[PDB]
Design a protein around this ligand. Sequence first.
Ligand SMILES: *[C@@H](CS(C)(=O)=O)[C@H](Cc1ccc(CN)cc1)NC(=O)[C@@H](NC(=O)[C@H](CC(C)C)NC(=O)[C@@H](Cc1ccccc1)N=[N+]=[N-])[C@@H](C)O
Ligand SMILES: [Cl-]
Ligand SMILES: [Mg+2]
Ligand SMILES: [Mg+2]
Ligand SMILES: [Mg+2]
Ligand SMILES: [Mg+2]
Lengths: 241, 243, 244, 226, 231, 204, 196, 250
Amino acid sequence: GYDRHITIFSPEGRLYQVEYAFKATNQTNINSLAVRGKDCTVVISQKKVPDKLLDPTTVSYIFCISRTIGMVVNGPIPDARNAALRAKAEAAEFRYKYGYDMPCDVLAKRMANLSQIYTQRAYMRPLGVILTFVSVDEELGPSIYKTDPAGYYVGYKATATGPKQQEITTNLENHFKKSKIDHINEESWEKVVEFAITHMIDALGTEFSKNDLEVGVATKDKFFTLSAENIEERLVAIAEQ
Amino acid sequence: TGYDLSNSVFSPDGRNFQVEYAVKAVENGTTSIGIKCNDGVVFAVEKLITSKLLVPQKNVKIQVVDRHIGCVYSGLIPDGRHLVNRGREEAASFKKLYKTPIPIPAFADRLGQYVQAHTLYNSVRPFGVSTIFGGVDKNGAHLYMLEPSGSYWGYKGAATGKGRQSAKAELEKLVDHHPEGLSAREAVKQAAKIIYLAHEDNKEKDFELEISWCSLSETNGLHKFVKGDLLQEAIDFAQKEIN
Amino acid sequence: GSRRYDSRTTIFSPEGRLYQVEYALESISHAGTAIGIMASDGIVLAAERKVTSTLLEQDTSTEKLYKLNDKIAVAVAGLTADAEILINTARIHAQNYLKTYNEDIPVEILVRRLSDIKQGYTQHGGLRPFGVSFIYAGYDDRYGYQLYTSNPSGNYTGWKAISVGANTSAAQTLLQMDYKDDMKVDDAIELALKTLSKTTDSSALTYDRLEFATIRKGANDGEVYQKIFKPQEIKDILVKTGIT
Amino acid sequence: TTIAGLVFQDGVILGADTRATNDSVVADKSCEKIHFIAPKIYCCGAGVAADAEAVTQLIGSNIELHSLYTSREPRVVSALQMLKQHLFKYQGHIGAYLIVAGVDPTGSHLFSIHAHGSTDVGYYLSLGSGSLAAMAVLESHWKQDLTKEEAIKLASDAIQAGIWNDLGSGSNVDVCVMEIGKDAEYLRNYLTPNVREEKQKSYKFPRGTTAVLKESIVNICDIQEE
Amino acid sequence: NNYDGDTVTFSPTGRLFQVEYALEAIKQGSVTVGLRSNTHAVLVALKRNADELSSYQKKIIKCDEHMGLSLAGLAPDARVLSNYLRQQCNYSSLVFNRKLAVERAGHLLCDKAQKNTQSYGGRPYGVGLLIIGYDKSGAHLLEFQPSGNVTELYGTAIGARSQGAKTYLERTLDTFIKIDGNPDELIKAGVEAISQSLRDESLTVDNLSIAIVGKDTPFTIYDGEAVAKYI
Amino acid sequence: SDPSSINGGIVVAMTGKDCVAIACDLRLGSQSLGVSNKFEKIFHYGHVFLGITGLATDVTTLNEMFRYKTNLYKLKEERAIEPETFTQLVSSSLYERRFGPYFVGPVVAGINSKSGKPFIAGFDLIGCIDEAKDFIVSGTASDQLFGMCESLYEPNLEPEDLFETISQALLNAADRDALSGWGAVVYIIKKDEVVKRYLKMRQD
Amino acid sequence: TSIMAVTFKDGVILGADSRTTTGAYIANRVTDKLTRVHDKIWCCRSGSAADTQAIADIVQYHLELYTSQYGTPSTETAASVFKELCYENKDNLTAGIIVAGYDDKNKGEVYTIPLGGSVHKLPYAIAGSGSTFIYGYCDKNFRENMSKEETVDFIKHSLSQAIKWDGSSGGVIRMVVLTAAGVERLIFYPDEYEQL
Amino acid sequence: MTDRYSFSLTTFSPSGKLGQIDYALTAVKQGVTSLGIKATNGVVIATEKKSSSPLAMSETLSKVSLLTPDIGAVYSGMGPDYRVLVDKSRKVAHTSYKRIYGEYPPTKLLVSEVAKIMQEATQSGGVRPFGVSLLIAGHDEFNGFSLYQVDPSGSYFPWKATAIGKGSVAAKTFLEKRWNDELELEDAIHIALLTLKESVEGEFNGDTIELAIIGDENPDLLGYTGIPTDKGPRFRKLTSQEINDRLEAL
Ligand SMILES: *[C@@H](CS(C)(=O)=O)[C@H](Cc1ccc(CN)cc1)NC(=O)[C@@H](NC(=O)[C@H](CC(C)C)NC(=O)[C@@H](Cc1ccccc1)N=[N+]=[N-])[C@@H](C)O
Ligand SMILES: [Cl-]
Ligand SMILES: [Mg+2]
Ligand SMILES: [Mg+2]
Ligand SMILES: [Mg+2]
Ligand SMILES: [Mg+2]
């Protein structure tokens, strides 16, 4: 049964190492969510600092890939950082060669093609991560594109990733069935972050303090992460209505 | 089964068993710790005196990278040395190109990516060390701990090896009892105590204490070994606390 | 390391056989039958297509008979994709020879080259061999009309008539029975089709199932013509010989 | 060679003469010096003709593959960056001097590229042996917010200045207009001011004038067949 | 068991079996002793013969004028590692006009051995080394294991029955460390130490191999009638 | 020293009404020494004709190279190459030796078998294409040929008239060049017949 | 070319003419020689335009990749990357670059990198063909900790003289102001600066 | 940090089977249905947009890809493997053909190059075969319209009409009854939509179906005017609205 150890086909036409890499994705037990506003793209992710000895400021699964592109990872941190460093290198090389900022969807495709190579070439293992790329693209507007260990990628109106992704997904599905639009009809990103947090609270059934969340926001010409105090301001506004 | 025979193979769980087996080599090794203080970091390590024939103060375990970073590790000692050698190359090329000495977070990812790369192929073995390292850069003090998987985080206190649970419990008390922070000279004393307390797990053979530190005020942000009177003061403090 | 997953494609069995060559030959025994017959005034190449579907576009289709140069053609039995890799190499070797010596490549030299490439895959590199057997039909001014075959081992041999692929045992007995040395192309055409008609696993032999070709020194003014038969022309020769 | 490019209200325009030379002899009286890169990106070429042609074709090919890969309209800055990095690599040994212009989602753009890999940004540019004749016209008459009708007039005038006053330049005027929100219109032989006058005599010979030693039919067909 | 096919594989308890099997080749090797004072450092080696017609396999190799080692295990691997040491000692002299520190020599051997334990295809070195030297910080004795572990010591022994000599040195520690400016008495203590590891056989003239380095003493090897004095 | 004028020679090509003509001299020399009076410079690959002037070793090498490439083209495409496509193949092949070029002046001539359109083209030694309606010239007497063609030529000449025009263009140009002449060949090309004629000219 | 960078109280200002010549022909009379390698790290280019553009493009790439990993680079770091390219490829380059940048910690800094690939940290720097004519003027009139208006006048007067005497220099005087407040572009036309 | 897999991972078994190719074909069988039909004046290729989530924007995932202006491709099997093949196919059309001959390759030769890439993954060291079957429809001047299938082995066959993937056996039978040599392009699109409805479970509309044609030249889609010889791409992807119009006359 060596068809389960390397990336070759099983008799069923399956790649077991790819399937097991998908399982490694949930090893962190962290749930992420991404939504789009009018002018922005918001990504939120659970933050869990179990050890008191840890420096909580260094515990993060959100990465600033370029000025415009942000990336949240669902999976172990070594593979997450492997993917982050590569995406940063690719985004920089793109800008140098072609004279404009790498689009979110093109980076996603590039990383997905790299992921595909690990599913076809035996000596390289798949990375056990799901990469969710976010930006406000200058042509396509607010953008969410997600990559997995299979090398699959697609654009999203909104998305969720983690152990409890299905609960978050259906919550978001039901909202967009009502509104009948592809985005959160909201002017400020602050209110789009409030929406994202609110709908994660409803979906997961858990309350959040400032240290339990981690937020990334993409606007036109920059992506940034919120501090604990910026999130606290968000949590106060949710509670007050 | 057979998923644990080759490195870089995912088990049906989503685990790399060879990396988990490297962790066992780390757990088998001597105790080493790191303490983040107000303006720096302190490193300490347990050195088992196998025999009277070992020359005291000679078999030095703690290693310097560049001039501002200290590294200590538990597990397979040669694997640790290999990682520090790489760390030194990474710190040299960073300084060569960018002039400034390598920041600690930047240095941490250099080791992180290198260790992680040794979980990507069956043609290499994972590292059999957990490495506690850190120092002072332009943004202040930083302490890190890096595992065989490539995983690393920033720490207030860190501990690894055979006496890690004992040490971790002692570090957790210091964090609770000193929220405003710990001084560099205090951290040296506490480091000595923690290694002495963690020695109950390796209690058969007697041991030799080794401490180092980087501190903005006490060492000008350079890595130095604790020697002579300051070392003996820490040993006396540690000996007093166990009795 | 990687050693664990290595099949070791280039080793001897205890009996002194090359495992992968033998298993490649087993693959080839299931492929559609190809027959080559050499006459005094030409060579016939006949071959049976494997995938009968009514929706297959036959007139633009080529799975069996390929042209290497103006003087040399091949009939394929085995993996078509593998054969095309080798065919393009053979096409290049012919043009390298023509560029170097300003003469068309002798048939045997082309055959030996391809056969040597196949041999290499059995002795080094750790790769699987090519799952292909060729029938080479060709002409040159030294030996005249020549038929050869090569197989995955890289061994090649010359023939007056020969089959490869499926039912070669049965096919070779029938050819050995009805072949004669003074035979002509028109007679060899009839023999080739009659042999396929008896050895075929199908219910009946039809035009949509066949690829057919002739190399004749019966062109205008003593030249050599390669004719790859069109579907309608295969249908006509089937009526002429009295099979349909 | 006289090539020029200038910007107008909602677009960019390129101009070029149609003469190719070998030292003092005219090899081609109607050659196309406005090269195609993408549907809405064009490149005026000067210097070594094979080099200008080859470098635009190569970058045009890579721009097409990039456009397919990214699912986007190609940008002029991409063509610019790729051209300059290629030319820089070869240290001027690829003697191509180019004016690149086009429209993309960013807007309309106009650049020049020198053989060693330096690039300029401009509202009006000219290259080749007729550049000074053209630039004199552009410096005299160019203004901001030109209409398309004024821009075509000015571009063709700039090229004409080169045609008449520069020996390296001649024959016809090619133009390419790239306007925002519209298909680029390529206007080969936009002006034809140099048609040859009717000859005084016909030099058609009486048949049998040339002495012949042998005749034969050439077999061009495949296989004369039975 | 299943995890000993190559050096690249950890066992479930975090062990490298190929390294441990290389370690076993040292235990099968003939005994050699190392010890030092503040002024001198001594190697004593029991050489092994194939039979009575054969020569006794040489155990001691010179690396520089101020450094050398004794071996126990695979002699060809000692030749590779000693050649590497010779080159590193030589590089230090040619480039920096500097005699290589004995501590730094150990670090280089450690790192060279380590590379063979982490990569596929290679094998660990099948030999243990005792390096003695005299450098700018006085006399030194090192013990090299092919796991990579190098250890600075006052005295030690490696090879078969080495535990007998190692215990003797552990008792004698306070005496032999003080043997300063007296090479013959330091060798006597090494010869008496290696005698504790003997069974059946005793120290003959072509059996025993001694080497010494010190303050005003280059690394020199004594064999044959030169060691009859100490029997 | 100048490779393009060691061996000498010329090629000219012209279009006519439903026809093309290509012609060349027969000289091969070593500077002043005449060596061969049978060195033809026009080759054909199916119905596409290629004339090549310049360094004779490269003339031979390129002929062998384009025979090679058009043979493989035909095997893969299952049809003969057309003049427009072959022109691009010549250009590609020359430009790939940009910094160590073949010292030649190629000339393509032929009729597109599908459209019936007469086609001629010329190139420099690194592959720049000159596609002409009227005529193409090449070789050591290219200046002389430009002068002859530019005055003698008129469009839409019938095959037998075009023969006279191209022949007189070649002969009179060759007679003003020391390194050209020693015989000449003219190919008259129509859609499905090609006539080849050897001309009588002065042998100095 | 006449280019300069001048540190002052609030930060640093880069200044340049706009003339690019091919011999005696002015190929571009409105060139922008002040080029951005990072938000608040800019450089002035002199020498081969191809070489300085190629270098600046590589530096911008390196600092973009630095920022993704390690946050905002220092001006010293930018100068080091410029130096590394210039020094290691000194046999194939003709580049004279002035690097100028604003940190909040270090405030305004200026580094000059002449032909050899050496680095020199200075209070102000001048370079390009037209700089020879203003060494005297700049040395006499430069003061440390000038105001923004004084530094703009110092650069305007300096480059006005460089332009006046150097044929290779001319056109408009472009400037780029680097402070905590942000990035300000200034332009000054012939009719303004010639009458100074 | 070495690639030590220099040996074939696809080998002959005792029965003569190449296991990995057979298993790749099994993966293709599990994949969503796609089909191709050739008319007299065009070719149509079609497939279902099987959306993995309703939050996903299925417009961004293109199963039907332009390879050249006159050639298009569709697949069944593993989507990532297809995506990288399209990237390589587009590139090889330039490097091994357009940069040499100054024109796009004919359908059969581009197919031959794709086939070659797939064959190499079936014999080279340390790789598995591609887990896709492609349908490649195209036009060129001398061969006219054509439709090719390409399998994981590297083998390719020309078809009048065919289907691959999930419901291919049923779909091929449906096409055998309906296909004739006098079909216009509109008739072939109509038959393609009828055939594809049988294999689709859920919604059946322009948003869940992807359909493209190789037909007449589209000078409107070219993007520029002024060259009479360049008349525009024959490849055209039908819009969501254009599909829905034909579903009313169904
Ligand atoms: C004008 C350029 S100028 C006089 O420098 O301003 C035109 C520009 C141009 C650009 C593109 C095209 C067509 N795509 C045509 C014209 N350039 C020239 O006319 C150049 N001419 C050539 O390069 C000629 C072209 C042949 C076809 C006549 N080639 C040569 O003169 C040399 C080229 C060559 C150069 C270096 C090494 C080898 C050869 N050859 N020969 N033989 C410009 C050079 O005049
Ligand atoms: Cl890619
Ligand atoms: Mg793999
Ligand atoms: Mg003459
Ligand atoms: Mg003469
Ligand atoms: Mg001036």
